Amino acid sequence: VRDAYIAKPENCVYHCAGNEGCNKLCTDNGAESGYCQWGGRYGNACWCIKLPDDVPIRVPGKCH
């Protein structure tokens, strides 16, 4: 498991403006919880806690 920004294809974070949406997005994908991280390195985006190793995460680079 890992704490990181969950990504959708291809290497794209989920923009957010509220913790609830991230919490639901993260837990729907196996994480224990999530919240919206403001002003991070990938903008305001969903951060998941204990996201499974098999769920993609945002890595350095662009979203495409």
From Swiss-Prot:
One of its GO terms (biological process) is defense response. One of its GO terms (molecular function) is sodium channel inhibitor activity. Expressed by the venom gland. It comes from the Eukaryota. Keywords: Disulfide bond, Ion channel impairing toxin, Neurotoxin, Secreted, Signal, Toxin, Voltage-gated sodium channel impairing toxin. Its main location: secreted. GO terms for cellular component: extracellular region. Residues 2-64 form the LCN-type CS-alpha/beta domain. It is found in: Secreted. Disulfide bonds join 12-63, 16-36, 22-46, 26-48. Binds to sodium channels (Nav) and inhibits the inactivation of the activated channels, thereby blocking neuronal transmission. This toxin is active against mammals. Has the structural arrangement of an alpha-helix connected to antiparallel beta-sheets by disulfide bonds (CS-alpha/beta). Belongs to the long (4 C-C) scorpion toxin superfamily. Sodium channel inhibitor family. Alpha subfamily. This is Neurotoxin BmK-M9. The chain holds residues 15 to 78 of 79 of the full protein.
